[PDB]
From a paper:
Central to the replication cycle of influenza viruses is the viral RNA-dependent RNA polymerase which transcribes and replicates the viral RNA genome. The influenza virus RNA-dependent RNA polymerase is a heterotrimeric multifunctional machine composed of polymerase basic 1 (PB1), polymerase basic 2 (PB2) and polymerase acidic (PA) subunits, that catalyzes both primer-independent replication (vRNA to complementary RNA (cRNA) and cRNA to vRNA synthesis) and primer-dependent transcription (vRNA to mRNA synthesis) in the nucleus of infected cells. PB1 houses the polymerase active site, whereas PB2 and PA contain, respectively, cap-binding and endonuclease domains required for transcription initiation by cap-snatching. High-resolution structures of the complete viral polymerase from a number of human, avian and bat influenza A viruses, as well as influenza B, C, and D viruses have been determined. These structures have revealed that the polymerase is a highly flexible macromolecule that can assume a variety of distinct conformations, enabling the polymerase to perform both transcription and replication that require different initiation and termination mechanisms.
Using cryo-EM we determined the structure of 17 polymerase-nanobody complexes at resolutions between 4.5 and 6.7 Å; this is sufficient resolution to accurately position each nanobody bound to the polymerase heterotrimer. Nb8192 and Nb8205 bind to PA residues 426–445 (site 4a) with Nb8205 also making a minor contact with the PB1. In addition to the core of the polymerase which was resolved in all structures, the PA endonuclease was resolved in the majority of structures (excluding Nb8189, Nb8190, Nb8192, Nb8196, Nb8202), while the C-terminal domains of PB2 remained unresolved in all structures. Nb8190, Nb8191, Nb8192, and Nb8207 caused a significant reduction in viral titre at most time points tested. Nb8190, Nb8191, Nb8192 and Nb8207 were shown to significantly inhibit viral mRNA synthesis. To probe the effect of nanobodies on this interaction, the binding of purified recombinant 1918 polymerase to a Pol II CTD mimic peptide consisting of four heptad repeats, phosphorylated on serine-5 of the heptad repeats, was measured in an in vitro binding assay. Nb8191 and Nb8192 were found to significantly reduce the binding of the polymerase to the CTD peptide. The site bound by Nb8192 overlaps with the polymerase dimer interface that has been identified as important for cRNA to vRNA replication. Binding at this site would therefore prevent polymerase dimerisation and, in agreement, Nb8192 was found to inhibit RNA replication for Nb82057 which has a binding site overlapping with that of Nb8192. Although the site bound by Nb8192 has not been shown to contribute to Pol II CTD binding our data suggest that it might play a role as Nb8192 also inhibited Pol II CTD binding and transcription.
Residue numbers in the entry:
A (entry chain C): 1 to 249
B (entry chain B): 1 to 185, 207 to 756
C (entry chain F): 2 to 24, 29 to 47, 54 to 95, 111 to 121
D (entry chain A): 204 to 716
The structure:
RNA sequence: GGCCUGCU
RNA sequence: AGUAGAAACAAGGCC
């Protein structure tokens, strides 16, 4: 109901009507990236400079109807002045902390299921067992190794269709996945995330990260396993070796 | 006793303590005003290194151009751009012979990419010179403006959605009698053929800031949008070629560079017997970009693309053809001050052609006098050579050809050489039975380099025995030695957001521990200092302290409200649980089991009004410009929390005549959000097609209302309401 | 965790002694005819030594100290330091 | 079909070698081209003066770097480093804990002996009476705060003509259009020439010497980290504790904290109170040997209008700092300072009691957003230094299969050359090397400039060449005079870079033997 | 005097 | 004046 209604409201005004009519689907990306905002050259300097202002961050308009304009002593939490090239309003950082102490609460039980990679890292490290540190010269030789320890033996494009069919089943188009490994992955990640309401985009991004294999060139000495490379900073050094066995093994 | 750190080198070798010689703890030099002086100096220097060439006047642009190719051979060691066509063609032929099938294959993959590439690939670029407004703007904005102007003028082949078609339209625009542009102060202005040619062939010049390692400032250039597609295709070909060359090091990272350097030094020295001596030259090329003539790149590519479809050759040749006629905008201008009357003034650079020379000092006066003959419509012709490393990969190809030309099969002498080339820098390992052989080999290498328009900087170069050398701030001494002073500037808060900054800092510490041999105790100290600076920057202190800030009240009440205070994030005033073992874990997941369910739910709430995600590309990618290197992007692990807000924008557009761009931004974003709600996959996979917005949106409204009734909330009343509302918007689009 | 005790020796009855252990910490003692006896830990002290003896620590020096005062012949034991790991113990002989 | 035609074809006909007429002909020639020994012919024909002859590099080859000559070098720091004085209260508050103005007033009330201020050493270019009146105004308004109910967290000062001149207000020339100002003869470019030449002075050497000396306080209170769980983490923590014990009692750490706090406060005030002049007391909190926490008040900073748009835009402030060092002994070091006499101090000494004078160094200084940001990240000097020391320790421990930190820091048997005395080269323990490197990094962050970067690069090149010579690797150069000229052009007027050049000359003299 | 902006 | 260094800041524009 609503969606077509703001569609009609947009088409009511002449300029947006022209934009909707003359613009083709292919140009979607271009106009979406059409912005006057330059990409910052020195982000640290301005982040240290903007945070000294009042209302340094930006938030959706809806914040004006969930968080009061001021806190107990009267420190303002949000302003009604919109951003430069968006309908979002500039708000103070307190509106963040406020949201974490009296804002609406939900059931975050499914975030562990979504962010599978990070929670698997945590579980692997929690059950790890350290050993003695041995001091001897390490011959670090540079090798190509896979960093992602949960890659399902799929490439970027190869798993992209799987991700769409898992999250966006209707926009798949011609592709119907042939490999049965992809079939089982689709089934599992479909039944697992059937009602998760985090965001389609973040779900797709994390599925891409988990399933897609990624490789990088690093100086290693021993190890060479996927689980042993994520902790390469902790097990191998310039003149010391720290024996380690992740919780998985 | 007087303390002197440098004397420490009397016991510790120079490379083992080279980090002490990198003052990367202070503010790097910045330029303050116009870069016009540097632009003029660079143009004059590029034109006078090729003075002995031949002059001509282009019949289309009417600008004077200098061709030094096949000019007189140099008779001195000064820089020279007199490259010889036959010599470079022979070098490329030998490169092909030593690597058969390189050019044909690379051309095949490049042909595939060119004929399947899309227009949107041009949006994935940093600032570009929009000619519609004569100023630098984001790549997407400039592309959109140029497409709009083309469509208004009648060039609508780009509607096919293909980059090749966009380039076809671009070339067709060159043969138009009169184009029309828009200006706000809206006014429609008409550009004749020559003016549009110069506007499409021109470059915008700026001054490079945050450049560490030299006393003087330099100038850099940014091209337009008409020529970036050809550049993209040419660089794709050059990258595909260099990926097949082990002597190149430009298309790889740092660790790969070190590995290849070690391999080449071991190969050269190990194969050398006791009788052969080995010497390493740590060479830098003086005026690398100013001495590389685009015509020679045209020759190299047309030799590479031999026995290929003529359309491929034409599309790959268009780029150097435009660079050979490239023009450069002088710059921002010049600012004058009058102390007697106590005032200041800012004259644009376009007045340099006619403005009197009484206001300029002797140096600038002479520079303007020398560059005036080349001024055409406020921009100077820069045919002789490249401006700033636009063809990095082709230059690397030429250098690799030079390196391979001494494989002992072409030297025809006992001496021989090899090494690694990365544009403007090289390491050359030369072996010969005696010092005379080494001298002859280096002399012939230098002479051959001078025949290709490449000069070796004698002041910044030195030769020693193999085993010790330098390459791009990587010091090799019987094995590469860590520096850690190049990455020091990256140890602070990045400046993206709270969660992003935390993750980026911990990940940078981890990486520099893995690669740059950062010590454990040093890493712990870095973690402590980073946490201190992070808390002091975001006003998020431990919470149990009495440090009054603008955010210390809400943080303190959250602290007193929470029961398990060990689960609070550092952003919310909680303890830091990070350590050397936890540097690869996001903060949210490390504290997940310690958080109270109420605070956990409030933090990671999808309905939060702070989190905003635009595209799959910008989810967890942060662009950090590294010190002493080109802009780079990093993947940082982070969980989407309420702290993932995006900061405020500039907001200074409101005082400029270009104020309508914000309204267009808002309307485009509203339409894009509506489309995304209609097409959820709009962000992850960019939609493709040739239909218009409202058609897809209305038709999908039809179908989705239908099916969501066939099972879902909709009802006949609502379904029919949607159907007739779709009809209403249909008849509205009719009129 | 390696531990070294210092500060033991021969002392007079009613005298004072400062044990130190270079490394949670405990001090325990063993007399020649017996097993381990709890002394102090860090604070808590056993009945036989309370008010006479004080346990303290410097977390910047990585040291735990046992300040013994008004010593009795019944304090004669090897005093061992321990970390939650054992030291080798330092002999204290009161007479 | 990608056809070149029309204007774009003619451009292709004008982008060929000199003796070609059309792209068709050039492509035909390229396709018909085959290698027939053309590089050899031109190599033979090319003049033999085009060579890369190698000049041997011997012990007698390198000459000392020449230093510029001129008036002595002046002080450039944003605060006093060697001549600072501290007024204290012995409070239990932590670094960030507390309110600035009340702490400053309480510290200043701890001192008795105030006298009516008078000029001792003039600025020599400004109006010293303005500085005097500004000091008295600061005192008066400090009392005004003391009287009222609760000390404000941040105070704004009145915009009197005194600080209007001292802060450079309404002095930027008004921006106009060129078409309205063309007949003005004085109208010309901004002064763009090489900076004034200045010769090195001996004060920077002593300042660095005393910047590496120990102190009676701990100037670093580090944050918390996750409890160590792995043995390697325990080793790292022990190493870190050793270095903290070595460097905390160091003037370099005190300078780090001073700069960080001052720049943070200045940046925050500039971003918040853009229009109105603001008072900020220089505060630094330390911990005594006895363990009692203490606050220290060096002086005050008055920040002016700070409407900073570009990263290079300058915010001007005026800094006042107490001291006991008489400026009548090294006047050339205080060219830009105005120094008054404000009181007398009595420090307990065996010679009765000194009753020394107590002066106020007052000056007008300026910074920028980039400078403030980089000065508020001075804590990475600790990193740089201690990473270097830990690299030394690890490299040595790779030889003997055992961690070597404890014996390095306690036995102090091994020593490194860390300075030269008239008797000869002096070596110090690893802790002294730590402090020396920390001081070097701190001074790099304080006296940063393009000269420093250029000299560092062009002298690292020569250092590598000299190291190759000392390693018996038959080093050679193509143009050493060019490298020397490249190094010598970076030495203009910066005290730090000139001191580095003098150090490099001394290292060359001691090396090459 | 009143209001707008701080990488456009 | 001061910062800074091959050109700039020492507020800008709009009424």
């Amino acid at each position: 109901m609503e969606r077509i209604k703001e569609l009609r409201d947009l088409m009511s005004q002449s300029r947006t009507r022209e934009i909707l009519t003359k613009t083709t689907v292919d140009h979607m990306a271009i106009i979406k990236k059409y912005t006057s905002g330059r990409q910052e050259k020195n982000p640290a300097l301005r982040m240290k400079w903007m945070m000294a202002m009042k209302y340094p961050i930006t938030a959706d308009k809806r914040i004006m109807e969930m968080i009061p304009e001021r806190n107990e002593q009267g420190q303002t939490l949000w302003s009604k002045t919109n951003d430069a090239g968006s309908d979002r309003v500039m708000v103070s950082p307190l509106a963040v902390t406020w949201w974490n102490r009296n804002g609406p609460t939900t059931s975050a039980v499914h975030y562990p299921k979504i962010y599978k990679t990070y929670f698997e890292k945590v579980e692997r490290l929690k059950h790890g067992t350290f050993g003695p540190v041995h001091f001897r010269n390490q011959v670090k030789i540079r090798r190509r190794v896979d960093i992602n320890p949960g890659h399902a033996d799929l490439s970027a494009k190869e798993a992209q269709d799987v991700i769409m069919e898992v999250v966006f089943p209707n926009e798949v188009g011609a592709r119907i996945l042939t490999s049965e490994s992809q079939l089982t992955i689709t089934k599992e990640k479909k039944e697992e995330l059937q009602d998760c309401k985090i965001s389609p985009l973040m779900v797709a991004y994390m599925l891409e990260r988990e399933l897609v294999r990624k490789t990088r060139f690093l100086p290693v000495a021993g190890g060479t396993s996927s689980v042993y490379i994520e902790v390469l900073h902790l097990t191998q050094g310039t003149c010391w070796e720290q024996m380690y066995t992740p919780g998985g093994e | 006793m007087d303390v002197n750190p440098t004397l420490l080198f009397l016991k510790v070798p120079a490379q083992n303590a080279i980090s002490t010689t990198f003052p990367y703890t202070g503010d790097p030099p910045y330029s303050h005003g116009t870069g016009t002086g540097y632009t003029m100096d660079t143009v004059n220097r590029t034109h006078q290194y090729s003075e002995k060439g031949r002059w001509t006047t282009n019949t289309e642009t009417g600008a004077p151009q200098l061709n030094p190719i096949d000019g007189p051979l140099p008779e001195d060691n000064e820089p020279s751009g007199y490259a010889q066509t036959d010599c470079v063609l022979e070098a490329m032929a030998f490169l092909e012979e030593s690597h058969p099938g390189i050019f044909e294959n690379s051309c095949l993959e490049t042909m595939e990419v060119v004929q399947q590439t899309r227009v949107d690939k041009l949006t994935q670029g940093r600032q570009t010179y929009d000619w519609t407004l004569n100023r630098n703007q984001p790549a997407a904005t400039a592309l959109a403006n140029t497409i709009e102007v083309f469509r208004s003028n009648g060039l609508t082949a780009n509607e096919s959605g293909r980059l090749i078609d966009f380039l076809k339209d671009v070339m067709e625009s060159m043969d138009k009698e009169e184009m029309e542009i828009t200006t706000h102060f809206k006014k429609k202005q008409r550009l004749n053929k020559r003016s549009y040619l110069i506007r499409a062939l021109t470059l915008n010049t700026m001054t490079k800031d945050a450049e560490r390692g030299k006393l003087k400032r330099r100038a850099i250039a940014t091209p337009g949008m008409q020529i970036r597609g050809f550049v993209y295709f040419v660089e794709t070909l050059a990258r595909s070629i260099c990926e097949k060359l082990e002597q190149s090091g430009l298309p790889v990272g740092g660790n790969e560079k070190k590995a290849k350097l070690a391999n080449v030094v071991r190969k050269m020295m190990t194969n050398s017997q006791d009788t052969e001596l080995s010497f390493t030259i740590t060479g830098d090329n003086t005026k690398w970009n100013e001495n590389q003539n685009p015509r020679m790149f045209l020759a190299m590519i047309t030799y590479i693309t031999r026995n290929q479809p003529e359309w491929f050759r034409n599309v790959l040749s268009i780029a150097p053809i435009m660079f050979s006629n490239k023009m450069a905008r002088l710059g921002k201008g010049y600012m004058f001050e009058s102390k007697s009357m106590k005032l200041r003034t800012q004259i644009p650079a376009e007045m340099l052609a006619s403005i009197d020379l009484k206001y300029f000092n002797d140096s600038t006066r002479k520079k303007i006098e020398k560059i005036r003959p080349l001024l055409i419509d406020g921009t100077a012709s820069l045919s002789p050579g490249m401006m700033m490393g636009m063809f990095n990969m082709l230059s690397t190809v030429l250098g690799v050809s030079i390196l391979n030309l001494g494989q002992k099969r072409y030297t025809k002498t006992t001496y021989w050489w090899d090494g690694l080339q990365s544009s403007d820098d090289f390491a050359l390992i030369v072996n010969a039975p005696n010092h005379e052989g080494i001298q002859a080999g280096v002399d012939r290498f230098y002479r051959t380099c001078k025949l290709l328009g490449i000069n070796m900087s004698k002041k910044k170069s030195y030769i020693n025995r193999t085993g010790t050398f330098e390459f791009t701030s990587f010091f090799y001494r019987y094995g590469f030695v860590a520096n850690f002073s190049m990455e020091l500037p990256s140890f602070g808060v990045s400046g993206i957001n709270e969660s992003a900054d935390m993750s980026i800092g911990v990940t940078v510490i981890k990486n520099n521990m893995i690669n740059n041999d950062l010590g454990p105790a040093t890493a712990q100290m870095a973690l402590q200092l980073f946490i201190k600076d992070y808390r002091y920057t975001y006003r998020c202190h431990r919470g149990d302290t009495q440090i009054q800030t603008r955010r210390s009240f809400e943080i303190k009440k959250l602290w007193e409200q929470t029961r398990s205070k060990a689960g609070l994030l550092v952003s919310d005033g909680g303890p830091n649980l990070y350590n050397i073992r936890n540097l690869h874990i996001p903060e949210v997941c490390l504290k997940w089991e310690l958080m109270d369910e109420d605070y956990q739910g409030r933090l990671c709430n999808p309905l939060n009004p702070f989190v905003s995600h635009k595209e799959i590309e910008s989810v967890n990618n942060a662009v950090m410009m590294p010190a002493h290197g080109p802009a780079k992007n990093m993947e940082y692990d982070a969980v989407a929390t309420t702290h993932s807000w995006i900061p405020k924008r500039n907001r200074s557009i409101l005082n400029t005549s270009q104020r309508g761009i914000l309204e267009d931004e808002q309307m485009y974003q509203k339409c894009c959000n509506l489309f995304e709600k209609f097409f959820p996959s709009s962000s992850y996979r960019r939609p493709v097609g040739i239909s218009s917005m409202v058609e897809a949106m209305v038709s999908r409204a039809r179908i989705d209302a239908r099916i969501d009734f066939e099972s879902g909330r909709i009802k006949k009343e609502e379904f029919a309401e949607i159907m007739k509302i779709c009809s209403t918007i249909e008849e509205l689009r009719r009129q | 965790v390696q531990l070294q005790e210092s500060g033991g020796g021969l002392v007079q009855a009613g005298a004072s002694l400062r044990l130190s252990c270079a490394a949670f910490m405990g001090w325990f003692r063993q007399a020649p005819g017996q097993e381990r006896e709890f002394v102090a830990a860090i604070t808590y002290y056993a009945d036989s030594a309370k008010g006479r003896f004080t346990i303290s620590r410097d977390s910047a020096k990585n040291t735990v100290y046992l300040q013994m005062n008004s010593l009795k012949p019944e304090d004669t034991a090897v005093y061992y330091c321990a970390a939650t790991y054992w030291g080798q113990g330092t002999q204290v002989t009161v007479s | 079909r990608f056809e070149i035609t029309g204007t774009m074809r003619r451009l292709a006909d004008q982008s060929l070698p000199p003796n070609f007429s059309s792209l068709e002909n050039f492509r035909a020639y390229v396709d018909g081209f085959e290698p027939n020994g053309y590089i050899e012919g031109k190599l033979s024909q090319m003049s033999k003066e085009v060579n890369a002859r190698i000049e041997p590099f011997l012990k007698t080859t390198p000459r000392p770097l020449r230093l510029p000559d001129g008036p002595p070098c002046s002080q450039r720091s944003k605060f006093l480093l060697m001549d600072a004085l501290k007024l204290s209260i012995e409070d239990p508050s932590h670094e960030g804990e507390g309110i600035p103005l009340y702490d400053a007033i309480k510290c200043m009330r701890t001192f008795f002996g105030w006298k009516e201020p008078n000029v001792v050493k003039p600025h020599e270019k400004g109006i010293n009476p303005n500085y005097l009146l500004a000091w008295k105004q600061v005192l008066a308004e400090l009392q005004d705060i003391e009287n009222e109910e609760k000390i404000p967290k941040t105070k704004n000062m009145k915009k009197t003509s005194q600080l209007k001149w001292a802060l450079g207000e309404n002095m930027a020339p008004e921006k106009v259009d060129f078409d309205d100002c063309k007949d003005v003869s004085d109208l010309k470019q901004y002064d763009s020439d090489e900076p004034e030449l200045r010769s090195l002075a001996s004060w920077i050497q002593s300042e660095f010497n005393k910047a590496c000396e120990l102190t009676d306080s701990s100037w670093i209170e580090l944050d918390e980290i996750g409890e160590d769980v792995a043995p390697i983490e325990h080793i790292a923590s022990m190493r870190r504790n050793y270095f903290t014990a070595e460097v905390s009692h160091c003037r370099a750490t005190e300078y780090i904290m001073k700069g960080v706090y001052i720049n943070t406060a200045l940046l925050n005030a500039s971003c918040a109170a853009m229009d109105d002049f603001q008072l900020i007391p220089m505060i630094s909190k330390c911990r005594t040997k006895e363990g009692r926490r203490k606050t220290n008040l060096y002086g005050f900073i008055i920040k002016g209008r700070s409407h900073l748009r570009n990263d290079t835009d300058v915010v001007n402030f005026v800094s006042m700092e107490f001291s006991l060092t008489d400026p009548r002994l090294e006047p050339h070091k205080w060219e830009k300072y105005c120094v008054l006499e404000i009181g007398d101090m009595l420090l307990r000494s065996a010679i009765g009691q000194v009753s020394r004078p107590m002066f106020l160094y007052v000056r007008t200084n300026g910074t920028s957003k980039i400078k403030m940001k980089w000065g508020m990240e001075m804590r990475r000097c600790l990193l740089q230094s201690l990473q270097q020391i830990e690299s030394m320790i690890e490299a040595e421990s790779s030889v003997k299969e055992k961690d070597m930190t404890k014996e390095f820091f306690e036995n102090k048997s091994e020593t490194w050359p860390i300075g030269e005395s008239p008797k000869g080269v002096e070596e110090g323990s690893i802790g002294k090397v730590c402090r020396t490197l920390l001081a070097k990094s701190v001074f790099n962050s304080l006296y940063a400039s393009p000269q420093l970067e250029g000299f560092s690069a062009e002298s690292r090149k020569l250092l590598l060449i000299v190291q190759a010579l000392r390693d018996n690797l038959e080093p050679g150069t193509f143009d050493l005079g060019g490298l020397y000229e490249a190094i010598e052009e970076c030495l203009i007027n910066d005290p730090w870079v000139l001191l580095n050049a003098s150090w490099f000359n001394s290292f060359l003299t001691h090396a090459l033997r």
